[PDB]
Amino acid sequence: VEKVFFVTSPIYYVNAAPHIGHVYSTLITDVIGRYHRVKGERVFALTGTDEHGQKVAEAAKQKQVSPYDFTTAVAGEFKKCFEQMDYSIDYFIRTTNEQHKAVVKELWTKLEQKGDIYLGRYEGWYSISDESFLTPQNITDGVDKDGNPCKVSLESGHVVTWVSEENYMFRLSAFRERLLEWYHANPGCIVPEFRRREVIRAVEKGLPDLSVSRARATLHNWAIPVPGNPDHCVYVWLDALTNYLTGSRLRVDESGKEVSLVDDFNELERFPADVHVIGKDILKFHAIYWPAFLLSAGLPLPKKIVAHGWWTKDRKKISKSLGNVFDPVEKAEEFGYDALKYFLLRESGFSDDGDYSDKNMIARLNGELADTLGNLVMRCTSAKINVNGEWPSPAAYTEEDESLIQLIKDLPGTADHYYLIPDIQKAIIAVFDVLRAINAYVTDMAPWKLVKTDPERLRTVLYITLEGVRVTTLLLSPILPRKSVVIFDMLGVPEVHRKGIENFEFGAVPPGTRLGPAVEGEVLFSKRST
Numbered sequence: 001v002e003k004v005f006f007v008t009s010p011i012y013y014v015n016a017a018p019h020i021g022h023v024y025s026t027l028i029t030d031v032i033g034r035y036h037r038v039k040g041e042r043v044f045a046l047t048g049t050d051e052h053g054q055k056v057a058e059a060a061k062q063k064q065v066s067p068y069d070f071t072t073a074v075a076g077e078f079k080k081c082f083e084q085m086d087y088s089i090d091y092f093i094r095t096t097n098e099q100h101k102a103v104v105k106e107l108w109t110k111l112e113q114k115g116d117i118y119l120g121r122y123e124g125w126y127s128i129s130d131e132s133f134l135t136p137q138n139i140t141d142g143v144d145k146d147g148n149p150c151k152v153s154l155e156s157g158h159v160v161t162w163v164s165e166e167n168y169m170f171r172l173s174a175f176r177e178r179l180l181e182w183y184h185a186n187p188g189c190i191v192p193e194f195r196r197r198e199v200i201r202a203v204e205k206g207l208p209d210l211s212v213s214r215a216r217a218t219l220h221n222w223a224i225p226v227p228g229n230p231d232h233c234v235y236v237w238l239d240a241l242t243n244y245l246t247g248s249r250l251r252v253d254e255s256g257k258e259v260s261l262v263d264d265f266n267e268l269e270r271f272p273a274d275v276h277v278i279g280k281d282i283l284k285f286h287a288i289y290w291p292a293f294l295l296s297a298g299l300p301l302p303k304k305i306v307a308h309g310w311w312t313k314d315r316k317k318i319s320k321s322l323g324n325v326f327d328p329v330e331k332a333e334e335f336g337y338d339a340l341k342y343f344l345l346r347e348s349g350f351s352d353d354g355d356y357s358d359k360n361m362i363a364r365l366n367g368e369l370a371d372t373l374g375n376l377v378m379r380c381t382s383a384k385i386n387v388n389g390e391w392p393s394p395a396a397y398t399e400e401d402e403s404l405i406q407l408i409k410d411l412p413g414t415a416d417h418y419y420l421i422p423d424i425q426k427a428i429i430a431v432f433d434v435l436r437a438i439n440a441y442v443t444d445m446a447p448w449k450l451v452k453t454d455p456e457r458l459r460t461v462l463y464i465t466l467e468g469v470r471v472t473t474l475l476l477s478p479i480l481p482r483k484s485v486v487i488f489d490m491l492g493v494p495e496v497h498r499k500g501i502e503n504f505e506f507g508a509v510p511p512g513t514r515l516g517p518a519v520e521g522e523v524l525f526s527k528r529s530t
Ligand code: MET
Pocket: 009, 010, 011, 012, 013, 050, 240, 241, 242, 243, 282
């Protein structure tokens, strides 16, 4: 099946300003999208905001403004933040959008016609802050914002409330067996593996039916009405997850505005998602509820859900109320955008709860970006080493030459696999393993000495080095989008050879290609003091 590769981020609640977790999640979405464009594939990358519900509506009452005005302002803050982060996201969706509402109503009606929705009751715990239903085994004792004793979530530590309401219920219990069939028939559909095992364990135990509406008063009427029943509003999560379907059905103009909603997802060839990027906090919604709603509605299921961990700064929680902030724009302005992106993507795998510190950020910038990559780019473009400012023609290869050539030839296949898991950390590590080898080759060959001593040999060493830099850079280009362009310019790589699987091949850029102009004081990654 050739289709549009469809990658998504979560849509974020707009109760508060955008912060590191949102930037991180959308970055991972963006990188995956960028990588597939570089392979020459059609790509649709989606992100946006989750704007209904009690959480958001009560956050707006606290600031004492209209919910329309509140959501519009905060959404604008998210949009501004993502523009500034310099992503290449194809569309930013808002659940307040009138076309999204239509899709939600259409899906609700499908589930109902299917016989999977009945009028019943939820009597149990609920976390407003997570918009999540919880069993008693998943709550514990704690203190509210006044220090009085209350109940809170084991998952998140937010205050839980007891809800007792007549609600429309989805027959999630009926989908246990099909969900298990699905997890087992597609054992790469949840990444990383231990989160996949977590989901299977939970569904093995059995599933209760799920409340998919609430009484309209409880929601302060800030939600989508249930079709045919004005007294109920649709569960914010059913509304929210539907953004993926909505997103798959929107024709978008050149300025990123939605101009049309198509009747059937097949028309745009995006649905279902090839990868849903999510944080571990919302696994159940994506890996249990979502596929159950799709099975009910007769819609195809996503190929992969990837769930990452949470960040800390200096081994402590990130918060404004506590004395520990982490502003990604400010850190990007301080250290550079591609560098900050590299760090967030290199420092932690999706299994781990990663940690930022200025110390570690600088060690990576200095060690990997500057000393390993930057150093190497300057050497092979240097007028002192590359006297003619060109890609030379190689003479015969020694076994050492070939050992390095083999590493460069094998790198794309290996990096490809890692990007497709996805495991962006391993992909980066694989590229830099090859960069380190190219450096050790250059040190071994000492091409500066060869300029006087063996210019024929220098041709070979210099050529292999240029091509190693080009290939490594091509594969890192989803990670370092701006800097890879600079590198390609310095190397003088023609535009055509900067994307496409054709240019994964060793030798795509011919000898005689001229290097780009050298600039007075340019340096690729500027080292920073410790
Ligand atoms: C369908 S993705 C919804 C995610 C939710 N708004 C959150 O911020 O956790």
